[PDB]
Amino acid sequence: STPSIVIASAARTAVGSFNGAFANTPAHELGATVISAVLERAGVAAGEVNEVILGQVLPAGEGQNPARQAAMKAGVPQEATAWGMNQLCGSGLRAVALGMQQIATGDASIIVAGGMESMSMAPHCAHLRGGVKMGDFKMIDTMIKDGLTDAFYGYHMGTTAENVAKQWQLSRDEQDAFAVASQNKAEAAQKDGRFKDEIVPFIVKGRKGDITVDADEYIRHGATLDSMAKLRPAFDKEGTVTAGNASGLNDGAAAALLMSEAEASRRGIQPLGRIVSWATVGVDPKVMGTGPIPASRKALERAGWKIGDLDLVEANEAFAAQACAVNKDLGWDPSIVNVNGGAIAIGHPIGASGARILNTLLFEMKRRGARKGLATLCIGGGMGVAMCIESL
Amino acid sequence: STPSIVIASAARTAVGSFNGAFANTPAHELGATVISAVLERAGVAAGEVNEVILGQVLPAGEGQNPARQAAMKAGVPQEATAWGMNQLCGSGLRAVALGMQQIATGDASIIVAGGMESMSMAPHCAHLRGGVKMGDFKMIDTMIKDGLTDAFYGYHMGTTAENVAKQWQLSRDEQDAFAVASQNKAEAAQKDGRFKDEIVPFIVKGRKGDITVDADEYIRHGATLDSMAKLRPAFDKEGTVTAGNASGLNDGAAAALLMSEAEASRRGIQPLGRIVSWATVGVDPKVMGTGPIPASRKALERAGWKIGDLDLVEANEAFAAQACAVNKDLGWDPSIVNVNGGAIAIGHPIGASGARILNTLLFEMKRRGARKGLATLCIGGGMGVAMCIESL
Amino acid sequence: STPSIVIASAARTAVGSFNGAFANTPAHELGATVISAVLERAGVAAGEVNEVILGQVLPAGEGQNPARQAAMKAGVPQEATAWGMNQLCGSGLRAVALGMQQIATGDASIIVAGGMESMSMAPHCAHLRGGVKMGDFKMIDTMIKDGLTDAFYGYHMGTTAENVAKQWQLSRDEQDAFAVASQNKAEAAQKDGRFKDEIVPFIVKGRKGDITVDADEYIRHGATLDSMAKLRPAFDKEGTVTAGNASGLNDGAAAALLMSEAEASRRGIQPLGRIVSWATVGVDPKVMGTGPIPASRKALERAGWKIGDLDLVEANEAFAAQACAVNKDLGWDPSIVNVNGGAIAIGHPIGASGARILNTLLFEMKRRGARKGLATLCIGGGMGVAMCIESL
Amino acid sequence: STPSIVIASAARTAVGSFNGAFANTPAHELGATVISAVLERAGVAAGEVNEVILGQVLPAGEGQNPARQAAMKAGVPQEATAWGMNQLCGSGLRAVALGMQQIATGDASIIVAGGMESMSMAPHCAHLRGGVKMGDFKMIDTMIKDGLTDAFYGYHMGTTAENVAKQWQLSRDEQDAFAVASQNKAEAAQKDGRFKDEIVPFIVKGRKGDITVDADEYIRHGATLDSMAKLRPAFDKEGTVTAGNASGLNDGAAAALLMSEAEASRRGIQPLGRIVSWATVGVDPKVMGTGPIPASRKALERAGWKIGDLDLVEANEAFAAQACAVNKDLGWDPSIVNVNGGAIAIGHPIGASGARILNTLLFEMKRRGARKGLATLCIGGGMGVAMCIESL
Ligand SMILES: CC(=O)OCCNC(=O)CCNC(=O)[C@H](O)C(C)(C)COC(=O)C(C)(C)C
Ligand SMILES: CC(=O)OCCNC(=O)CCNC(=O)[C@H](O)C(C)(C)COC(=O)C(C)(C)C
C-alpha cells in the first residue's frame, strides 16, 4: 500500500549557451514556459496545480521568489504555492524528489517540479552597507562565487575534477575521447529529432523580431579529437581538465508534472514513468564528482534493483574526469549511459540540470521502450543525488 | 499506524538589529551555532545527522550552498547532505515540514531544519556581463529587491500592509496599540528570562575582542502609545503603516532537530512536541498579509482540531495591519497569541523567521504546559504557511 | 616690446570613435605620441622642454597627473614639470594660452601645451565610503556626469543646444544641412590628404598585433541628407537636435610646442604662427553654445582685428544649432569656416578638442597661405574661448 | 617698472578629518564659502571677479568643472570664467601663481585662485564599457589611485617617503619628534586663536540641524611621543614612516584674491602681500618629497633673495621624513618654519593644500610683522612648487 507517484509529463527548454540565445532572459520566464508545457502535455489545467517547486542556484536580483514568478506567469492561480531550493547541481532532480514527497505525505495532489537557471543573467555584487572607508574592493561574480566555487577549499569545481583525475589516474586522452563521444552522440541525436519531444520551444521577445529557440545551441557540430587535444588545461598547467572536456556555463529550465498513479489513470494520462526511488548522499568536497556513486547505490538499494537491472542511465557529465570515474566504480554498460549525449555537449544550467537530464532519460526511455532508468548528478560541496524511474 | 515525527530539540540565536550585532556575520555562521545547539540540547552527535535543511532568501555572495556551509562548520560530517530553500517569510517553518517529510517517507531518520538570514550582509548587485557602453546603472540592494519587494506589482511589503489595513478598516490607533502591546510583551518576556531557554548565545569574533550576544537587540525598551503616534506613514502619505507598527530588518538563525517519536524514546529524549500537521496556501499578492487565515484553517482541518483547542499561537507580525486582521478573522483569544511578543519587537530575519517563532512557541508551550499550539506566517507574493504542534 | 610667442610645431592623433580604435588606450599614451611628434617636428629635444600642460576633463582612474605620465613617456626629463587643467571643451586651447603665458612672464622658454582625452576609458563611479545602508544607488558614468551634464540645470549639453535652436529659430532642415556639409567637407579633406600633415600616427599595441591608426575614423563617408533627416530628436521629442547634427563621443590628443619668436629665430624654425591674442568669456549656462560669440569678439579686439580681417576660422561644432548661431551672430563668411569639416564629422574628444581644431587651423593656414586665423570653442557651464593666430 | 601683483585677501575653511566634518560636503561647496570670504575680506564684489582658478585633484563624480560650480554658488557672474587644474599637492599654490599670470599679462584684473578638495567624497570606480562577461573585477579607490599612488613605480607616496628617509639617514625618532612638534605647535596655535583670522567658518547643512565648523579637526590634542613610537611602519616592515609621522587624508578649501598693486591702492586695500616670485621644478619621482629643495632655491633666486633673508616659511609636511630632508638641505632656521604647526597636524586636503599653507603664511606674516615669506610643497610624480611673498 506504499504511495506510487508517477511523472505524468515533462518538458525542458533548449539549453542556451552563456550569454547566447537566452542572454537577457530571466530564469523565471524559462520556468513559466516549461510549467505551461507540462500542463498542456498532460491535459491538466493550471488551476489544479497545488504547488510549483523549482531549483535555482543563482537568483540574485530576480526579485521575490522566482519560482512563484514562474508559476504566476505560467497561469497557475494565486491559490497555489511555489518555492525555490538549492542543492546546487542536484537541485533540478531533488526538486522532483521533494514534489513526489508532497504527494506521498498526502499534502498535495499535483506538483510541478524541476529547475531553472540563467547563468547569463547572474549579476556581480558586493556588500556595501558598512561602506569601504579606503582602498580598492572586489565586485564579485555571483555565478562563480555562489555557483562554481568550493566554499571550503576556495577553488573552482574544475579543481575537484583534477583531484578525481589523479585518484583515478585518468589520462588526458581518456577524457578527450569521452567528450568527443558525448558531442557526437548529442549531434547525432539532435539531427535525428531525439530532443524534439522533450524540448518545448521558447519565444525570446525582442524589438526587431521575436526568435523561437528550440535547438540546444551549446552542442558542437563535427567535434574532432583535434580541437579537443589542442586545448590548454584550464585549472592546472600539468593537468588534464579543459573547456573541451568540462561542461560549460548555460541557461535553461525543465520540469515534470507529478501526481499519484491512480490519479493519472483517472485523468486518462499515459505517464512517462513511476518514481520508484531516490537518494542523496555526501562525499568529500575535494572530490565532489564522485557523488553519483553512493547516491546511485543507495537509490538502487531502495528500489530493490541491481546495477545490471538498468536499461538506461543519465549520469550528468559536469566533467569528463568525474563521469569516467563514476562509470568505472559503478561499472554499468557505458553504451546505455548518456545515450543521446550529456552535459559536456548539451550544457549545465546548474539548478535546471537535474530536471534536464531527467527529461532526456524519460523521453528516450519512451523512444526505445526501456523499462528501468536512473538519473544522477554530482554536486558542489560534495554530494550526489539519484532517482530510479520505471516505465508503465 | 502513521509515522509520527517529533521536534526532539530546538534553538535559535538572538535576533540582531540591522547592521547591529551581526552586521558582519555570514548567515551560515549563525546557522552553524544553532545546528550545534540542537544536537547538544538533544544529546545527539552531529555524525548522526542525515540532512540539514535551511530556509534562506538572501544568500547572494555567501558562496556555494550556505546550508552545506552551516552543516560543515557545525561538525556534521561530509557524508551527510544539506540544502537551502526559499518560500520567503515562510522559509524557516517550511524547512521543518520538509524535514518531517524526509522522515515520514523513510528517506531519513534525523534532520536539522530551520532557517537563517543575514539581511545585513546582503549585497548590492548589477547584471554587468553585457557591459555598459554608456549611461548610469543601478546597483540593486538584493535585500529590498529579493526579500521585500513584490515581483508582480512592484512595491514593498509595507504597501500590501496598506491594502490589508484598508480592506479591514484598521485605524492607525489600533495598529499602534498592537505594536506597543507587542513591544511591552517582549520587553517583559526578555526581562523575566523567558527567551533564555530558546536562545543559544552566538560569539562574534572580531579583531578587538569576542562579543557574546544572547539578547534580542531589536526590542524597544519602554515603548509607549505616545512614541508610536508621533511617527509618520512609511509607504502612503495618508496611510496607517509606519516603522513603529511594522517589523524590521534583522539577522538571525533558528532550527529544530527532528526524528521519529520512537527514536526519541530510544534515546531518552523528551521532545518539545509532535508535528501533527502543516499547510501552505496562496492568496492575492496584493494582500499577502492575509496568508495565515487559509493557512491556519487548512492546518487545523488536517490536525482534526477546532480553533478553540489551541492553547498557544505564534502568528508572525510582519505588520500590525495584517497581524490584527488575521486575529480578528480567526477569532482566537488574542491573549494566547505572541504571548512573549512578536516580530514588530523581536525582528524579522526573513528566512529564519518561521523557525524563530516555532522556537518561541515550543519553549513557551513547555514552560506553561500547553498541549496544542500553532505557528503561522504570511508570505510575500501571496502565501501563508502554518504548523500544528502537540506536546508529548 | 610686448612678448611675442609662436607655435613652432603642432600635432594631433587621429580622432577615434567611441569605444573604437582607441577603446582601451589611456589618454596619456595618446598624449605621449603627440609630445614626441611636436618635438620631432620642431627639431627640439625632449630634454629642452620646461613644462607640459595638458587639458583633460576625464582622468578618473588613470592615476596621478596623467599630464606627467604623458611627458615622462615621451622622455621629457624628470626636472621638467607637467600639470593638467580643465575648462571643459575649452581646455585644449586654454592650455596653449596658459603655455604662452609661462613664456610671456619669463617663467619658461619651451612649453608643450594642448589636451588629451579618452572618453572610452572614462569609468563608472560611486561615493561608497559612508556606505549605502539600504536601497539602490547609481553607478555614475563619469563621462556623462563630469563631461556632458550641466551642473546647474541638470540636463545634457544637447538641451543647451535645443535652447539655442529655439532662441535663434534654427530649423531641423538648417541644422541637418549643416551636419551633412560638415561630413562631406571632412570626407573631401580626408581623401585629398589634408589631415596628413597634422595627424601623427598612433600605434595601438595589442597581443595578436599592432595596428597603426592615422585616419580620423568618426568621419562618415557618403553621408546623406536622408540619413540625418530620419533620425529622431535626441533631447526633446519636439526638438531639432539629434545624434546626426551633434558631435560625438571621442578619443584623441593634440598639442603645440611654444617658444618665443626670438628663440624660434635663433633655432632657425619656421613657426606655424604667432599667438597674437586670446580670450575667454562667460555666458548663460542655458545657452553655453553661444560662448564663441563674446570670446571671438574679445580675442579680435585684443588683436586689433576686425572680423573681416580673418582669412580662416575654426569654430568648433559641438552642435549644428550652436555652430549656426555663432556664424549668424559673427557674420564671418561661412566659406572660410571649418574649411576641412568640423567636429560633427571629426568628433569631440573633450579635453583635446581645442588643440585639435587649433591643429586643423594651423596646417590649413600653412597650406593655403592664410595670414590671420582664429580658433574658438563653446564650453559647458557657459563659457567660450578664442585665439587669434597670425602667420610669420 | 615691472607688473606687481598682490594678494588683497585670503581665507580658508578649517581642514576636516577624513569622513569627518565634511564627509558629505562636495568640494565646490567648500570653495564657494572661501570665494565669498575673500571677496568680503577685500571689500570687493563678486560681480567684479574676472576668473576663479581652483586646484583639485579628485573631482570625479562632482559634475562639470567644479571650479565653475563654486564660483556660481558664490554669486560670481555668468560672464566670468572658471577652471580647475591639477599639479597634485602643488595645485592650490600653483593656481595662485597661474592667477597672478592672468593679471601680469593684462588678461584679467581680479582673480580668485586657490584650491579645494574632498577626499572623503572621492568615489570608487571601474571602467565598464567593454563589460565583464565573467569573473571578479576591482572597484578602484580614486583617492588612492589618482591622488596618492605613484604612476611610474606603482607604490604609495609613503614609499617615496621611505626612499627619502633612507637617503638622508633619518631615524624613526627624529621623524617622530618632528611629528610630535607639529602636533604640539598646531595645538598651541589653535588654542591661542592664531587660526581664527585665516579660517572662515563653514556651515554643514543637514536635516537634523546645521553644524558650524571653524576648527581644524585633525589636530591631535596632547599628542605624546609614546603615541608616535608605538606605531608600526605603514609602508615597509623595517621602515620608519608611520600614520603618525605622515599627514592625513583631509577635506578643505582655501583661496586668495589677486589684483595688481596699483588696483589695491586705488581701492584702498591693505594687501596681505606682494607676490615677488614663484617656481616649479621637477625631481626623481622616487624621491618626490625633495621637490621643495630645487623649487625654493629657484623661487629665491628669482626674487633676488638669500635663504637667510626669509623671516617666515611654510614648508608643507607631507611626511616627517621629507620635511626633515628639505629643512636639512635648505638650512633655514627651523624656528621660522611651520611656526603654527604643519600638515602632519593640520591635515593634507591635496588640491587645497598649497593655498592652505599660503593662508597660514600670510596671516602669520601679518600678525608678527614678517617682511619676507616663502611657501613650498612637494608634489607626487616628482615636483616642487615655491612662492616668495613680501609684505607691503
Ligand atoms: C559637450 C560636447 O561634448 O559636445 C557635444 C557632444 N555630443 C554628444 O556627446 C552627443 C553624442 N550622442 C550620441 O552618441 C547619441 O545621440 C546618444 C543618444 C547615444 C547620446 O546619449 C546622450 O543623451 C548623452 C547626452 C548622455 C551622451
Ligand atoms: C604626498 C602625501 O600623500 O602627503 C601625505 C598624506 N598622507 C598619506 O597619503 C598617508 C595617509 N596614511 C594613513 O592614514 C595610514 O598611514 C594608512 C596606512 C592607514 C593609509 O593606508 C595606505 O596604505 C595609503 C594607500 C593611504 C597610503
PDB file of N, CA, C and O in Angstrom, chain A residues 157 159-165 167-168 283-294 315-327 329-330 376-384:
ATOM      1  N   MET A 157      35.110  24.406  -9.163  1.00  0.00           N
ATOM      2  CA  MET A 157      34.734  22.998  -9.326  1.00  0.00           C
ATOM      3  C   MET A 157      35.739  22.214 -10.169  1.00  0.00           C
ATOM      4  O   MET A 157      35.959  21.033  -9.917  1.00  0.00           O
ATOM      5  N   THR A 159      38.870  22.110 -10.184  1.00  0.00           N
ATOM      6  CA  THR A 159      39.985  21.572  -9.398  1.00  0.00           C
ATOM      7  C   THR A 159      39.583  20.306  -8.648  1.00  0.00           C
ATOM      8  O   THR A 159      40.405  19.422  -8.440  1.00  0.00           O
ATOM      9  N   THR A 160      38.327  20.232  -8.219  1.00  0.00           N
ATOM     10  CA  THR A 160      37.789  18.979  -7.688  1.00  0.00           C
ATOM     11  C   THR A 160      37.814  17.901  -8.787  1.00  0.00           C
ATOM     12  O   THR A 160      38.074  16.731  -8.507  1.00  0.00           O
ATOM     13  N   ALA A 161      37.583  18.308 -10.036  1.00  0.00           N
ATOM     14  CA  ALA A 161      37.671  17.394 -11.186  1.00  0.00           C
ATOM     15  C   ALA A 161      39.107  16.915 -11.410  1.00  0.00           C
ATOM     16  O   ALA A 161      39.309  15.771 -11.767  1.00  0.00           O
ATOM     17  N   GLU A 162      40.092  17.795 -11.198  1.00  0.00           N
ATOM     18  CA  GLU A 162      41.511  17.418 -11.231  1.00  0.00           C
ATOM     19  C   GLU A 162      41.856  16.408 -10.131  1.00  0.00           C
ATOM     20  O   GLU A 162      42.634  15.478 -10.367  1.00  0.00           O
ATOM     21  N   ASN A 163      41.294  16.608  -8.935  1.00  0.00           N
ATOM     22  CA  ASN A 163      41.505  15.700  -7.797  1.00  0.00           C
ATOM     23  C   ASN A 163      41.008  14.287  -8.100  1.00  0.00           C
ATOM     24  O   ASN A 163      41.606  13.304  -7.655  1.00  0.00           O
ATOM     25  N   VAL A 164      39.908  14.206  -8.851  1.00  0.00           N
ATOM     26  CA  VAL A 164      39.335  12.936  -9.290  1.00  0.00           C
ATOM     27  C   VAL A 164      40.170  12.316 -10.414  1.00  0.00           C
ATOM     28  O   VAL A 164      40.298  11.101 -10.483  1.00  0.00           O
ATOM     29  N   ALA A 165      40.742  13.155 -11.281  1.00  0.00           N
ATOM     30  CA  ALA A 165      41.619  12.698 -12.367  1.00  0.00           C
ATOM     31  C   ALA A 165      42.926  12.096 -11.858  1.00  0.00           C
ATOM     32  O   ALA A 165      43.606  11.382 -12.596  1.00  0.00           O
ATOM     33  N   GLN A 167      43.199  10.629  -8.474  1.00  0.00           N
ATOM     34  CA  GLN A 167      42.824   9.484  -7.647  1.00  0.00           C
ATOM     35  C   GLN A 167      42.511   8.267  -8.532  1.00  0.00           C
ATOM     36  O   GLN A 167      42.809   7.118  -8.178  1.00  0.00           O
ATOM     37  N   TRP A 168      41.911   8.542  -9.689  1.00  0.00           N
ATOM     38  CA  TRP A 168      41.510   7.509 -10.647  1.00  0.00           C
ATOM     39  C   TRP A 168      42.500   7.385 -11.814  1.00  0.00           C
ATOM     40  O   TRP A 168      42.306   6.557 -12.702  1.00  0.00           O
ATOM     41  N   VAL A 283      29.807  13.218   0.115  1.00  0.00           N
ATOM     42  CA  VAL A 283      31.187  12.782  -0.097  1.00  0.00           C
ATOM     43  C   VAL A 283      32.115  13.981   0.134  1.00  0.00           C
ATOM     44  O   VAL A 283      31.671  15.111   0.265  1.00  0.00           O
ATOM     45  N   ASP A 284      33.405  13.712   0.165  1.00  0.00           N
ATOM     46  CA  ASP A 284      34.434  14.725   0.355  1.00  0.00           C
ATOM     47  C   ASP A 284      34.259  15.887  -0.652  1.00  0.00           C
ATOM     48  O   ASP A 284      34.319  15.672  -1.861  1.00  0.00           O
ATOM     49  N   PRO A 285      34.018  17.103  -0.169  1.00  0.00           N
ATOM     50  CA  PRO A 285      34.061  18.299  -1.027  1.00  0.00           C
ATOM     51  C   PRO A 285      35.188  18.309  -2.073  1.00  0.00           C
ATOM     52  O   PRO A 285      34.936  18.691  -3.218  1.00  0.00           O
ATOM     53  N   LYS A 286      36.393  17.897  -1.662  1.00  0.00           N
ATOM     54  CA  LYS A 286      37.581  17.813  -2.528  1.00  0.00           C
ATOM     55  C   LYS A 286      37.375  17.016  -3.821  1.00  0.00           C
ATOM     56  O   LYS A 286      37.918  17.388  -4.876  1.00  0.00           O
ATOM     57  N   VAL A 287      36.610  15.921  -3.719  1.00  0.00           N
ATOM     58  CA  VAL A 287      36.329  15.035  -4.848  1.00  0.00           C
ATOM     59  C   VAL A 287      34.810  14.889  -5.045  1.00  0.00           C
ATOM     60  O   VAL A 287      34.293  13.781  -5.183  1.00  0.00           O
ATOM     61  N   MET A 288      34.127  16.037  -5.094  1.00  0.00           N
ATOM     62  CA  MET A 288      32.665  16.127  -5.234  1.00  0.00           C
ATOM     63  C   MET A 288      32.057  15.368  -6.427  1.00  0.00           C
ATOM     64  O   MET A 288      30.875  15.010  -6.403  1.00  0.00           O
ATOM     65  N   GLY A 289      32.867  15.132  -7.461  1.00  0.00           N
ATOM     66  CA  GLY A 289      32.426  14.445  -8.665  1.00  0.00           C
ATOM     67  C   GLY A 289      32.046  12.982  -8.492  1.00  0.00           C
ATOM     68  O   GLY A 289      31.409  12.391  -9.371  1.00  0.00           O
ATOM     69  N   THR A 290      32.432  12.399  -7.359  1.00  0.00           N
ATOM     70  CA  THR A 290      32.131  11.009  -7.051  1.00  0.00           C
ATOM     71  C   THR A 290      30.730  10.846  -6.493  1.00  0.00           C
ATOM     72  O   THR A 290      30.271   9.725  -6.290  1.00  0.00           O
ATOM     73  N   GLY A 291      30.059  11.966  -6.250  1.00  0.00           N
ATOM     74  CA  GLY A 291      28.750  11.989  -5.622  1.00  0.00           C
ATOM     75  C   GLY A 291      27.785  10.941  -6.144  1.00  0.00           C
ATOM     76  O   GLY A 291      27.117  10.282  -5.339  1.00  0.00           O
ATOM     77  N   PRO A 292      27.701  10.787  -7.472  1.00  0.00           N
ATOM     78  CA  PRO A 292      26.797   9.805  -8.091  1.00  0.00           C
ATOM     79  C   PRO A 292      26.988   8.369  -7.650  1.00  0.00           C
ATOM     80  O   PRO A 292      26.058   7.584  -7.847  1.00  0.00           O
ATOM     81  N   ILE A 293      28.156   8.028  -7.103  1.00  0.00           N
ATOM     82  CA  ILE A 293      28.446   6.655  -6.707  1.00  0.00           C
ATOM     83  C   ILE A 293      27.554   6.215  -5.531  1.00  0.00           C
ATOM     84  O   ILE A 293      26.698   5.353  -5.717  1.00  0.00           O
ATOM     85  N   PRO A 294      27.731   6.778  -4.335  1.00  0.00           N
ATOM     86  CA  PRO A 294      26.888   6.381  -3.199  1.00  0.00           C
ATOM     87  C   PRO A 294      25.399   6.741  -3.357  1.00  0.00           C
ATOM     88  O   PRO A 294      24.547   6.036  -2.821  1.00  0.00           O
ATOM     89  N   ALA A 315      23.809  10.039 -16.457  1.00  0.00           N
ATOM     90  CA  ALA A 315      24.788  10.384 -15.436  1.00  0.00           C
ATOM     91  C   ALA A 315      25.441  11.696 -15.832  1.00  0.00           C
ATOM     92  O   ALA A 315      26.263  11.754 -16.754  1.00  0.00           O
ATOM     93  N   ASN A 316      25.069  12.758 -15.133  1.00  0.00           N
ATOM     94  CA  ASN A 316      25.453  14.095 -15.548  1.00  0.00           C
ATOM     95  C   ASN A 316      26.957  14.278 -15.664  1.00  0.00           C
ATOM     96  O   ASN A 316      27.712  13.973 -14.736  1.00  0.00           O
ATOM     97  N   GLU A 317      27.371  14.762 -16.830  1.00  0.00           N
ATOM     98  CA  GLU A 317      28.765  14.996 -17.134  1.00  0.00           C
ATOM     99  C   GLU A 317      29.076  16.443 -16.819  1.00  0.00           C
ATOM    100  O   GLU A 317      29.010  17.291 -17.688  1.00  0.00           O
ATOM    101  N   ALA A 318      29.393  16.730 -15.569  1.00  0.00           N
ATOM    102  CA  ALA A 318      29.961  18.032 -15.229  1.00  0.00           C
ATOM    103  C   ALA A 318      31.373  18.168 -15.789  1.00  0.00           C
ATOM    104  O   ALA A 318      31.769  19.234 -16.269  1.00  0.00           O
ATOM    105  N   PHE A 319      32.126  17.072 -15.680  1.00  0.00           N
ATOM    106  CA  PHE A 319      33.483  16.951 -16.202  1.00  0.00           C
ATOM    107  C   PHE A 319      33.666  15.542 -16.748  1.00  0.00           C
ATOM    108  O   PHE A 319      33.037  14.592 -16.293  1.00  0.00           O
ATOM    109  N   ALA A 320      34.532  15.406 -17.737  1.00  0.00           N
ATOM    110  CA  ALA A 320      34.827  14.095 -18.281  1.00  0.00           C
ATOM    111  C   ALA A 320      35.493  13.297 -17.177  1.00  0.00           C
ATOM    112  O   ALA A 320      35.218  12.109 -17.015  1.00  0.00           O
ATOM    113  N   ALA A 321      36.345  13.980 -16.405  1.00  0.00           N
ATOM    114  CA  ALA A 321      37.101  13.354 -15.323  1.00  0.00           C
ATOM    115  C   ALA A 321      36.180  12.643 -14.340  1.00  0.00           C
ATOM    116  O   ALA A 321      36.428  11.481 -13.991  1.00  0.00           O
ATOM    117  N   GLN A 322      35.115  13.320 -13.904  1.00  0.00           N
ATOM    118  CA  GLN A 322      34.254  12.720 -12.884  1.00  0.00           C
ATOM    119  C   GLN A 322      33.359  11.637 -13.470  1.00  0.00           C
ATOM    120  O   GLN A 322      33.081  10.637 -12.803  1.00  0.00           O
ATOM    121  N   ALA A 323      32.938  11.823 -14.722  1.00  0.00           N
ATOM    122  CA  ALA A 323      31.984  10.924 -15.367  1.00  0.00           C
ATOM    123  C   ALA A 323      32.596   9.538 -15.528  1.00  0.00           C
ATOM    124  O   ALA A 323      31.967   8.543 -15.177  1.00  0.00           O
ATOM    125  N   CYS A 324      33.832   9.487 -16.034  1.00  0.00           N
ATOM    126  CA  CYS A 324      34.566   8.236 -16.240  1.00  0.00           C
ATOM    127  C   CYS A 324      34.792   7.498 -14.929  1.00  0.00           C
ATOM    128  O   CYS A 324      34.638   6.280 -14.865  1.00  0.00           O
ATOM    129  N   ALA A 325      35.143   8.242 -13.884  1.00  0.00           N
ATOM    130  CA  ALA A 325      35.306   7.686 -12.534  1.00  0.00           C
ATOM    131  C   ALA A 325      34.023   7.016 -12.022  1.00  0.00           C
ATOM    132  O   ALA A 325      34.075   5.926 -11.457  1.00  0.00           O
ATOM    133  N   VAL A 326      32.888   7.688 -12.216  1.00  0.00           N
ATOM    134  CA  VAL A 326      31.586   7.147 -11.846  1.00  0.00           C
ATOM    135  C   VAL A 326      31.271   5.877 -12.655  1.00  0.00           C
ATOM    136  O   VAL A 326      30.873   4.873 -12.085  1.00  0.00           O
ATOM    137  N   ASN A 327      31.464   5.919 -13.973  1.00  0.00           N
ATOM    138  CA  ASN A 327      31.189   4.770 -14.846  1.00  0.00           C
ATOM    139  C   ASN A 327      32.080   3.566 -14.511  1.00  0.00           C
ATOM    140  O   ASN A 327      31.703   2.414 -14.769  1.00  0.00           O
ATOM    141  N   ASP A 329      33.608   2.962 -11.179  1.00  0.00           N
ATOM    142  CA  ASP A 329      33.279   2.459  -9.837  1.00  0.00           C
ATOM    143  C   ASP A 329      31.984   1.654  -9.848  1.00  0.00           C
ATOM    144  O   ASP A 329      31.912   0.566  -9.271  1.00  0.00           O
ATOM    145  N   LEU A 330      30.967   2.212 -10.499  1.00  0.00           N
ATOM    146  CA  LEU A 330      29.645   1.597 -10.583  1.00  0.00           C
ATOM    147  C   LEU A 330      29.644   0.417 -11.549  1.00  0.00           C
ATOM    148  O   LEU A 330      29.032  -0.614 -11.266  1.00  0.00           O
ATOM    149  N   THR A 376      21.310  10.720 -12.351  1.00  0.00           N
ATOM    150  CA  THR A 376      22.130  11.074 -11.190  1.00  0.00           C
ATOM    151  C   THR A 376      23.147  12.158 -11.483  1.00  0.00           C
ATOM    152  O   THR A 376      23.654  12.260 -12.593  1.00  0.00           O
ATOM    153  N   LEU A 377      23.446  12.958 -10.465  1.00  0.00           N
ATOM    154  CA  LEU A 377      24.286  14.140 -10.616  1.00  0.00           C
ATOM    155  C   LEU A 377      25.222  14.289  -9.432  1.00  0.00           C
ATOM    156  O   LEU A 377      24.827  14.084  -8.283  1.00  0.00           O
ATOM    157  N   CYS A 378      26.467  14.632  -9.725  1.00  0.00           N
ATOM    158  CA  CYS A 378      27.412  15.062  -8.709  1.00  0.00           C
ATOM    159  C   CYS A 378      27.080  16.514  -8.322  1.00  0.00           C
ATOM    160  O   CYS A 378      26.437  17.225  -9.095  1.00  0.00           O
ATOM    161  N   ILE A 379      27.531  16.946  -7.139  1.00  0.00           N
ATOM    162  CA  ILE A 379      27.117  18.231  -6.541  1.00  0.00           C
ATOM    163  C   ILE A 379      28.247  18.919  -5.793  1.00  0.00           C
ATOM    164  O   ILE A 379      28.866  18.319  -4.924  1.00  0.00           O
ATOM    165  N   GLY A 380      28.491  20.189  -6.130  1.00  0.00           N
ATOM    166  CA  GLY A 380      29.491  21.021  -5.466  1.00  0.00           C
ATOM    167  C   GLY A 380      29.327  21.030  -3.957  1.00  0.00           C
ATOM    168  O   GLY A 380      28.207  20.972  -3.434  1.00  0.00           O
ATOM    169  N   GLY A 381      30.449  21.069  -3.254  1.00  0.00           N
ATOM    170  CA  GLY A 381      30.447  20.924  -1.813  1.00  0.00           C
ATOM    171  C   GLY A 381      30.410  19.473  -1.356  1.00  0.00           C
ATOM    172  O   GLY A 381      30.494  19.219  -0.153  1.00  0.00           O
ATOM    173  N   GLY A 382      30.294  18.534  -2.304  1.00  0.00           N
ATOM    174  CA  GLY A 382      30.409  17.107  -2.032  1.00  0.00           C
ATOM    175  C   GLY A 382      29.118  16.341  -1.752  1.00  0.00           C
ATOM    176  O   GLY A 382      28.876  15.913  -0.629  1.00  0.00           O
ATOM    177  N   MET A 383      28.289  16.152  -2.772  1.00  0.00           N
ATOM    178  CA  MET A 383      27.110  15.296  -2.643  1.00  0.00           C
ATOM    179  C   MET A 383      26.706  14.742  -4.008  1.00  0.00           C
ATOM    180  O   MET A 383      27.159  15.205  -5.048  1.00  0.00           O
ATOM    181  N   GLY A 384      25.847  13.741  -3.972  1.00  0.00           N
ATOM    182  CA  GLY A 384      25.220  13.184  -5.152  1.00  0.00           C
ATOM    183  C   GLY A 384      23.735  13.060  -4.878  1.00  0.00           C
ATOM    184  O   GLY A 384      23.311  13.060  -3.729  1.00  0.00           O
TER     185      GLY A 384
END
